[PDB]
Amino acid sequence: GSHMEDFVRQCFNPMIVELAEKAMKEYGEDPKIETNKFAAICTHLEVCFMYSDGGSKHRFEIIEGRDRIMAWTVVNSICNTTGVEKPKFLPDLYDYKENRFIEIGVTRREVHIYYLEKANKIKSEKTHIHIFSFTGEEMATKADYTLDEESRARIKTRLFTIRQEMASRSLWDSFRQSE
Numbered sequence: 001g002s003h004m005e006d007f008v009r010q011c012f013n014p015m016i017v018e019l020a021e022k023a024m025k026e027y028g029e030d031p032k033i034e035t036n037k038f039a040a041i042c043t044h045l046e047v048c049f050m051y052s053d054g055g056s057k058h059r060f061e062i063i064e065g066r067d068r069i070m071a072w073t074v075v076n077s078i079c080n081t082t083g084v085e086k087p088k089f090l091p092d093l094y095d096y097k098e099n100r101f102i103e104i105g106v107t108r109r110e111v112h113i114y115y116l117e118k119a120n121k122i123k124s125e126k127t128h129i130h131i132f133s134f135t136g137e138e139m140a141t142k143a144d145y146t147l148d149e150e151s152r153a154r155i156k157t158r159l160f161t162i163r164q165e166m167a168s169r170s171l172w173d174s175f176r177q178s179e
């Protein structure tokens with residue numbers, strides 16, 4: 001039982017922890033062993049939820065946080081209703097306002113590297129990419145950041161607080177040296 005596991009459980013909302021645990025076990029992975037991956041999945045999950053809470057009431061369908069089958073079910077309904085092409089890879093949200101899927105990224109390296117990595121993987125000129133770093137940078141497809149500055153600033157503040165909280169516990173370096 002690691003210090004990182006206990007930190008995660010006190011740092012993140014219980015529903016977030018439970019969803020992250022479920023995600024990991026869906027692919028056979030142990031949150032008690034892959035503890036940096038645990039923290040990362042919780043973080044990404046919270047970002048996705050804060051992101052969908054930006055903007056107006058019915059704006060985003062949340063794909064992330066569901067099991068594989070239901071996530072693709074929702075993607076299928078979105079495609080077979082809006083006519084948007086079916087992504088090769090599961091995204092994180094759908095924007096009913098802009099009519100595009102969103103892939104959220106949270107990285108401990110420069111937003112540039114990670115954006116290039118995700119863009120080359122999906123390759124769809126369709127799925128919108130939005131990367132946040134733990135240093136407060138962000139990078140988004142076609143310089144279009146979807147949300148208000150205020151809703152994005154909230155996410156960046158939260159990411160930096162997670163980083164400080166890891167640091168005060170001497171877990172940050174292991175977390176960063178694991179991505």
Ligand SMILES: C[C@@H](N1CN([C@H]2c3ccccc3CSc3ccccc32)n2ccc(=O)c(O)c2C1=O)C(F)(F)F
Nearest residue numbers: 023024027029037040041044089090091092104105106
């Ligand atoms: C399963 C879905 N994944 C994979 N993987 C994911 C995950 C989930 C469970 C077990 C292992 C891993 C790899 S590590 C990681 C780290 C942080 C956040 C999410 C995750 N992703 C990494 C970055 C993302 O932005 C993202 O959306 C995912 C994601 O959604 C998929 F798309 F493949 F179906």
Ligand SMILES: [Mn+2]
Nearest residue numbers: 064090091092
């Ligand atoms: Mn995802």
Ligand SMILES: [Mn+2]
Nearest residue numbers: 092103104105
């Ligand atoms: Mn993502």
